[PDB]
C-alpha cells in the first residue's frame, strides 16, 4: 500500500515535470509564432503600401521577390489539434482523479479495505499524508495541463493566422508578378546549377491502374 | 426532525455542489468539442476526440428526480 502510493506519487511527479517541460516548449513556440505573425503582418502592410504607391515600377518586382523570399514557410508548423486533444484528455483525467480523491478519508478507508491485518494508526497517517500529497500533485498537474492547453490553442490560432496571411501575400505577389546580358545569363545559369536541390497506398493505386490497362488491352 | 432536516440539507448541498461542478465540466467539454469540430473537421483524430469526450461524459441516469423531495419539503 505504502509502496504503491509512493510509486504513484513518483509517477505523478514525473508526469508533472514532463508536462511543465512541454508547456515551456509550447510557450516558446507560441512566442516565436506570434513574432513571425507580427512580422508577416508588417511585411504585408508594407507590400500593400508599396504596390499602391509605386505601381508600374521596375523595382516593385524586385521588392515583391524579396518579400516572397523573406516570407516564412508554414509547412514546418505541425498541426496542434492532436496535441490539444491529448492535453484536454489529460486534464479531464486529472480532474476526475482529483474529484475521486477529494474525500481523502473515504479514499483511505476504501484502500484500507481487505488489508486490516497490515493497517495501524501510523499506517493510516502515512496513507492520509500520501493521499494529500497525491491530491496536491494532481492539482498542480491539472493547472500545468490547463496552461499548456491554453498555450497550444494560442499557438494554433497564431499558426493558422500566419498561414492565411502567407497565402494572401503569396497570391498578391503572384498577381503583381503576372501584371553584359550574355555574361549575366551564364552567371545566372551557373548559380542555378550550383544552387539546384532535390527534395501501400501507391501500390494499391498502381494495381487498379494496371487492372484498367489490362482490361483495355483485352477489349 | 430538525436534526434530520439539517442532515438532509447538508447532503442536498453536497449533491448540488457536485452537480454544479459536473455541469461546469460538461459545458467546458461541450465548448471544447465544438471548437475541435469547427477547427479540425475531416481529421481522423476528431473521431477519437469525440469518442473520448463521450466516454468521459457523465451519465445522468444516476440522478434521481427531485420533484417529490421538493414537494415534501414544501409541505
From Swiss-Prot, chain B:
Subcellular location: Cell inner membrane
Superkingdom of this protein's organism: Bacteria
Family assignment from sequence similarity: Belongs to the MscS (TC 1.A.23) family.
Function: Mechanosensitive channel that opens in response to membrane tension and specific ionic conditions. Requires high concentrations of external K(+), NH(4)(+), Rb(+) or Cs(+) to gate. May participate in the regulation of osmotic pressure changes within the cell, although it does not appear to have a major role in osmolarity regulation. Forms an ion channel of 1.0 nanosiemens conductance. The channel can remain active for between 30 seconds and over 3 minutes; it does not desensitize upon extended pressure. Its activity is masked in wild-type cells by the MscS channel.
Protein name: Mechanosensitive channel MscK
